[model samples]
Target: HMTDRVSAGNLRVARVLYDFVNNEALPGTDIDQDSFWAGVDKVVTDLTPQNQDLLKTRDDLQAQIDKWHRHRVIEPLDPQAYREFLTEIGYLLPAPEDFTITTSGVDDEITTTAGPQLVVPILNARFALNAANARWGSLYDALYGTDVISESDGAEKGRGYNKVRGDKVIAYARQFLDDSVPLAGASYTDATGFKVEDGQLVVSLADTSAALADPGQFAGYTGTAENPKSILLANHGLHIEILIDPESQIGATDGAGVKDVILESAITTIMDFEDSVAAVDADDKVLGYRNWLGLNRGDLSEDVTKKTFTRVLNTDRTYTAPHGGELTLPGRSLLFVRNVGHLMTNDAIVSDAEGAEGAPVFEGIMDALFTGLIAIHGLRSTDANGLLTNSRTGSIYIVKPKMHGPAEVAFTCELFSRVEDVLGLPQGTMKVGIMDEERRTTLNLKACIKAAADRVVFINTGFLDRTGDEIHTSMEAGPMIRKGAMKNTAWIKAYEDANVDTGLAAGFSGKAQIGKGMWAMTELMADMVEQKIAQPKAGATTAWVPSPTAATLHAMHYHKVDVFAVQKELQGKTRTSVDELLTIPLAKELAWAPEEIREEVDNNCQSILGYVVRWIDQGVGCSKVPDIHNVALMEDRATLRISSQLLANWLRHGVITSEDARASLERMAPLVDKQNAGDPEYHAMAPNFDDSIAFLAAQDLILSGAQQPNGYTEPILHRRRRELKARAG
Candidate 1:
């Protein structure tokens, strides 16, 4: 495994990354190529040691916690002792004095609007393009295709379109209109025609004509005033476009000639270079950076297979304002680039120290500098009529994931400041989105928020990674409760409540975003429609969705529940106690039968292997992988962490032995292979498990999960993936 390195000052840069920055990333920007490399060298040299020290801090705290748990032999450990111990070890910092975020120049998506957010692996162009274009999606298509419009009543989506299903979809959409944009005197179902007359939307129903119940809801129109091509309506800060095309198939059958309802679905999207991606080396990192460059430049396109055409960013929707002038709205989702955390290093750049000659530089430092450097293209170019770019406010949004505590948060803020200085940008130009996943960060969240008060734009809770950290942080305590039972645990509830409570306490309501985690079951839209509304109802500004269709469906949640109003109602509420958060969620007694234990291990083993196979063999990071029961769930590094950590904790506590864990993995190998039999690119691990690198990677995760830094799967996955790539080469 050899890397082609280019020396710039004291830094050794990979040829791929060097060429990318010089020939592609920096040409259009005002920064000089030589000076860019010099800035990179300066930041890397200065920040690499600090990054290592943070990791050491994580290890040191974990050691103390493990020893503390081991020293106590009683079940249901003392809660007061636990809190005192954590505070003594500096794991739980004092909550900062109450302060409001002074974050300015934030876009409306983060401040005012609340809708679904898509987190896609930026390494894949198609997924990235789709997520960006998911700003507007057809509400009819979202309802008709998914289980939301049930298949029970002659509405089974067959090889072709079904009219019965179409009728049901129409009825559902009409009810949505009544619930959101209601007519003054009647329901949308009774409307025979739609027209904008005298700068007002008038609907003809029966023998009476009525306007929107609230005339202010009529935003704009596309075609003639007498008979518009489309009508734009606003509710709860999200736009809804009613497409009127009498000549079209579905519209022709309708009285009002409405074709589809287009909802502003994914208001914001995170172009992820973090958990959802499998970029292990310089070449892989270059791919992700290049795609991000294309997105910021607004020319990112992907080849489509339904027809051989290029799918580019959607043009801004232009409309005639009701009163007078023209109106335009962004045609794409607002973009945020999520950077890797302080843990990992990449060989994309190396140190110049003699014994550390090939030692890699911190990946997070490289991410901040390079991503910020590329963003100058968007900031410098200003043309509303030309290609529309992201960040209309001249700010660069970078989401930093997996930071431990306030110190790590402050480190990220400083890193962003240094990046801004290197790029000659204003202070606070680089905004940070903190992932409130780690245990320390969760416990001291207010302090974390205060550390990046001026630069923080988003904070969200993730159940998967949070649970993984919970298990690893308390591994020596006892055997953890069942994976299915983790959600109902005491700390889980406290963590979820505390995230939004603390965010609102710091004035995140209308200034920055308070988000929720992903809905992993892609095919279960009906269930999502029933359950996922809790996010917005809980005052979350946004929640993650798996795909564009899901985004469209989930957008309805924001319309139904006014998040800002909910936030207003939730303000000044009592914060969840930190003692409740310290509850270890340990199983009191191990009374599970052998069958129950097999079920748990098999479930964990299948998910770990199913996701790891594609990650190592194909370099595919995030996907819908089948679970033990063959239900496809959105699997990524976060989900992998939780499953492996659970099994590791069980094995560590003698709830399951090493042979038991290995046996479950061996039994699940053939099952996972069968699940992927339809995928042409899949390499099976059934016949020869030892020969498969993917299988071995999964094994390492479960067997050595307790020892991995903070129970993260990145180090092992990165090593195994790089080995596979080298072997293939």
Candidate 2:
């Protein structure tokens, strides 16, 4: 496959990549065309070697850990010895002295407001636009559509709108209002009318007048004061807009004419250029960058059939403040551009080094320059009305994932400095969000934060990738427990607690974000609503949601639990111990029948095949893939890493043989093929398993997972994807 290359300083850039920067990303920015590519040349040249070194450290450390485990397989793992070995090999560094983040120019979404965060693929414009516009969602729609409102009675959601279900939704919303903006002396169910008078919310119920228990919660209103079009209330720093109209169907049926409740749903969204995207080459990368540019430019629009018109970034919602003046709320979520990490490189841009002429460009370096460059669009406020941009604060938020330790974190900070200097921006213009997924970073998290203390704005725990690292780092220890049981393991608890504890210890509680991982279940809203609350209740300022609907429902969690109050309550409390974190989750007393082992193998095999096939053949990085039980899940690289590594570990320890793993993959291939029969672009992996690229790829992942660097599937997936793209070309 030949690339149409354009020569730049020390680089042979693919035409697609060069045009993206020269013709598009660089024009409106402060940086000129010549200087931008030159700056990127320096970042790639200087940091490329350093990036390689850091990855080498990861390999060396993993090898030492593998030896330590293999030698001690018969004996019980010596906790003290393990810690000492890690220290000796420079895997774990001492925690840094206490310090607070000094990051500035952050929006309330990152620093103060506590709400659900969405991470969606940027390559898909409709999904990207939907996520960006998910700042406010209809609570009525969220409640009515999902299992949050059950179908147990005659209230089932049928082909038509069910008034029974609508009434149930209304009653539930009223109860929620009671909990959030309660009446002074009466219940919301009894309140027949809602009216704002004299900057006070007064409810008419059975000839009695009552006001909000907290009058200050009545922030603003639309339409007439006596008969308001919408009443705006605040609880736990999130907005709730109650729209009223006697003309509307649902509102006409109600005495109060309350039609809908709009909740400030995804207050923050990470427009991901990372895990959830399949940008393996220049074409894919340019597509993502272009859409992101559209988002940044505020002209990002999508053709919509349902609306019979194009959808653009939502205009700011305006209302009259209760006391007097005009009030306006941002109509879109605060956006953060999540960049790729230091591990992988892309053929999109090749090095100009003599012997290594066609060497691939370090993806992380390329992302740092391009994404940071694209974000300047948000910083430049050319709009007559300034509320249309992603970042209101004029700062670029870039989330850096998969860095190993402080050196890598420090290198990222340095790289950001260069990008800023090249782009002629002020110091600290670029803020970093650390993904604490790697073990070296987790053990040395405090030190890692200290390295980027002046620029760190967000830090969150990711379970799937972290668990994958856990299994890979300890592959020789023993067979890992069932994939279902990883969360309950000792290390998992310590890892979660330690992330928040360390973040708080470093003063990220209120000044910056402390976040949690995603809830993988997409269709089970009842289950998500019941369980996902623990994210905020555990003092997390932000947690990831799967969709806009999920974000709306999960926003209710923040309303239920004031994360700042929760953080305050837990200040100076006991945190997770590092010693507990070192305890490997090795399965002992393993006595499983062949059938029991098949169940475990089948689950992993199905997930791996389901996700890998789409990733390789269709270039889909993230999607809702079906599992062995036919349950749909939001599958991405993180999920794939954990599943593949688990099977690899199980195969290594004799819990399951290679034949067992291969047989399971063969059996599950047809099922996965059938699952995707409806998708027009999907390639089947059945009937010709040997000829099927996806089938062969899945088998390689299971058989060679232990041999993979840090248990990452990128290398295998990228190889297969590039090959498929080349063959098709």
Candidate 3:
């Protein structure tokens, strides 16, 4: 084999990885470089076989499911019979007997609070920094800038700070205050001042009348007693801090001198190394590690040019308590690092011995070892010694995505154990967050949680990836309903209900997070503000949002619904049936019009290409890719998985021709280019369609979609992205 030599061991990229582990990650820890590298070698060597076996199991089970579905093609479907057959065939594991997770050492954000969660690709430093800083978001900006408020009633948002929109935003925010944190005998709009007396928040009228409907909502105050700068209020286990600065433009006109409403938004954020990132090789992986290092060390910042002035990450804010003490809050988000799954390998490290060519390295193993190693720097630091830290409980949070079943979860727990042993950390120091995205995992969630019960900190539903896996798992059954209709299907509701039920049954009420998926439609905050609240009410402690502004808006839902209380109430409820989870979403006696079929195919194909083009050509991982109607949807590998699989299934069932799929991409190419016109590094797919690797990849995804393993987008996207990177180099 021709060797590419640089530093570290032999690979230049490996050297970067080594420097990070040795100089940065291991500096404060007791583990030295030699011990760390040796442990890495051991983990890669030992866990590689286990990872391979788990992946093989995934393939074997998928093959069996496909064969069974094919054999039953001529028979009429019976949900009960089909579910029985699945259970008999070992496709669905029995629910575990009642038990609770013993996971300790979790941060309060993940354990007790319900709020929005942001998943930013770790490969991009700027995006990572933004996500880490999204812990607190501006309610004023979220309402004023978005369509949440009506723009039709002379509330247009014009260029360069529209005062009219600002006024509308203030009025709407005041209404929220009146509803959530009401004064006793008057509205917040009528208040002239807010003061804290006897540890209770008092709203003072211009005529010396004072009121507070629930004075207990007053958590603390910031600044002086007579002229406070910020007032903090708590409701339903969430905090809303009001900023009052008379010198500020917004505050100057306000009767109460309120400048901003800072909602405790994304309580926990997933620093994603999976769907949101396009890290195909060693270099990209190193960028991710570097950012994680920066974050763990509390030194992560990005420079931006705004209005001809440079801006940095905001500093931590301080407040004065009502009891004459001081209170300080972190200016950054609580972070959880989401590692790659059991599949996928990188050449960041190569075997020093022989027989390494065809051997697959587990990206999850590498992520567990290295990301935990990096977090040790923060784990050992005290408030007087180190920077802003994430875990106050001395544990590292690692979210493992796309595991198959209890065995895979067990394998992850074992892998983290080895990593901890390698780093000489205490046992159970690394926590696991099982992403209930795969079908098998959803069906066997109780067993899965039991597998990692000692260290489970988070579990969430990913509807996009779950649906993709659903389509692939039952590809031989029949064509699935359209993407939009999948949410209302029995399987989706069952999957969601089962996830929360399993979490509560496993004692996640105040111990770990029961999370929901992302709000893909970032432009529709009005709909989101109205609809996404259902996640919290449905017992999710955390739900994913696209942006910081969305986090702020989504935080309102948490204040309205106490998720912990919901979880407690739901603890005694029966679990949603695994039969419903395994119940395939096959089209049963439903037919679509020719136009409807064409529209669905075009929508799916256009979305796949729109994301794939940027991912493969420009190496952009997660972005708001415009759909067929030109509305931007937050596109990631999960989106690609479902879109590609949907088109592939339709192609297989003859709902659309291969020619139609290709032609749709061709027609939508220019529109995608126009959508990305603002990006300087974008490569257009229309003019040079023949030479475009991304265009070809999109076509291959549709053409060979049925053959993909569980309808994953990684294989195609990774190969094409590497090819593009090689060509660019």
Candidate 4:
């Protein structure tokens, strides 16, 4: 290892990580060095073997599945037999009959609000800052820039301010206002002046005076009642601020002088230390941990371009309440951190001492204590001296991903309890957000949440990684349906329905959150506005958004559909068959047109090469990668796993030959190379495929994906990244 280590008894914590904990994390807190180390050592020692066993269970289950497929190579799947075998193999389990989450102390963001959620790589400070600062975004900008507004005729978004497009935007916004917060006597389009009258909003029009249809929608305002600068409105627990100024360019042209509407977007942000970040070693891990500490301390600031000043945490918003009191709103997205899963172990805390033994430490175990420690610092909060608070409820939200089932969730709960004990925080102070992104977890999701019911604050469907695990679990069954057809699969529909149905049944409606996965096409906001409404309608309290702007636009969906109401409607009611969830998404017949095979191979190969190259060489864990048709797709390891596994399954079956995969990869390498040529730091994978680690690493994923643990891309990517990191030495 290149870094120095702190020589504590039986522990060799990396100097950076140790110093971070001691001088930074532990100072203000009551925790001292000896106690902290002792706590860490105890948790690590107690949980190490259990963590290893859980990973082994995953492997064992996979091996048994492969054997089953091998034995029945020619036979079609019998659903009853398959379910029975799954139960016997211990992958499937009995569901809890009745339960409600008793998770308390959750902020309204997680408990009651239905809004957009953002996920950002914790390793990058700028992106992390953006995510944290995205609690509110300008609705006008979200519409004007994205495809959410049509660009037909003169309404096209030109180089400069397009008043044509602005008018179209204004028209749509007026309708949204009328729909969300309507006037009693007139539409928002007819309002000529805005003012607060007698602690209630009064819309002044030339023809008549009108007020909000529901007086409760008018929450507060800024400036004098007669000439208000901004009017704050609340609907479905989310808020919006309408800024009025006649001197403003857009507002000057308007009769009402309303310049912009700022929607409370990105209600929560997941500072991800998992799939979105490539933290290979101590330095990378330390960097991410440090930023998280800054976030908690409310002092995190990043220098933007020369034209802009440093980006800092937003100050809390203040508005005069309709009832005449100071109403303050949180100015930042309530932050949650996603720790790495059980399988990956880090070398950051190795030693030759008795307790340490120089062995690798489970990343999840390490993250739990560190993240919890930092969160404790934020819990005792005041916003002065460059500091702010994340949780008004004294809660630390940690999203735990990829845990196989209830046992693993239980293990995580136990670990969190130990962390709370270690950090001197109250029990359940550190809340768990369970990601139902694994096959085993989804099948037994109720039990998983029950395992952490006292602290489970959030549960969401991440369709990408879930599908990846599904493919790997049934790798030997046959080639899967094409990647494009995965959403149409019976299992996927059941997965989505069951996630909401189960969460609703378990009292997640008002007590905690039910979430849905991301819309991968970030630029297609029009389509997003049109379709993503289904998430809230499906009873999901929150759904993932790619950017702050997307969050602003997706906020409309929540405004339109009352998620809690949907949950209440869906409660105790079943939709798709749970048996359908158990059904494998395997392709029935081995019939594919030659062109179809080529297209599959080429499309998958292109994505793998393009993403892997950046991941291994540049250490970019998440970015927008071009599809076969050059449509930009937001890519992460979850998407990586599915694409590689699809190719692997095809290679294992007779659907595509090794030569076909090889030829497609070689052909797609040039395309990936050409696409990435614009990035100066980018290296070409073509010309010398033999010597390119990134090129070969991606090929290895396809060639050896069947054998990869859970068909995860982490091991291959981690090994190759380490090679690159070491070679630079």
> What total of clashing residue pairs does each candidate reach?
0, 0, 1, 1
Query: What ranking of all candidate models by TM-score puts the best one first?
Result: 1, 2, 4, 3
Pairs of colliding residues, candidate 1: none
Q: Look at candidate 4 and give me any clashing residue pairs.
A: 351-358
lDDT of each: 0.90, 0.87, 0.82, 0.88
lDDT of 3 by residue, 309-355 (tens): 33344567777776877777767777889999988877777654235
Q: TM-scores, in order shown?
A: 0.98, 0.98, 0.96, 0.97
Output the better candidate (1/4) by TM-score: 1
lDDT score for candidate 2 against the true structure: 0.87
Question: How much is 341 displaced in model 2, in angstroms?
Answer: 0.6
* Candidate 4, 1-729: lDDT as tens digits: 566888676667898888878877776676877988988888887788888899998988889988988999778768888889889988888988788889888898888788999999998999899899999899888889988888888788876789989988888889889989888978888889988778998899988889888998988999888899999999989998999999999999787999998999899999999998898888889899989989988888899995888998899999999868889989999999999988898888874534445887888999998988888767766542135778888889999988899999999999999999988888889899999999999899889989998999888998999999999988888888888989998899999999988888888877888899988886778788889998988888899988888889999998898777777777788787767987788776756788888888899999888888999898999988888978788899999999999999888887888888888989999999999888899889888897888998998999999889998888889889999888767
Stretches > 4 Å off in candidate 1: 353-355, 382-386
Q: Model 1 scores what on Cα lDDT?
A: 0.90
lDDT of 2 by residue, 404-446 (tens): 8899999999999988888888889999999999888898999
State the TM-score for model 4: 0.97
Stretches of candidate 3 exceeding 4 Å from the true structure? 1-13, 307-315, 352-354, 358-360, 382-386
Error of 2 at 124 (Å): 0.8
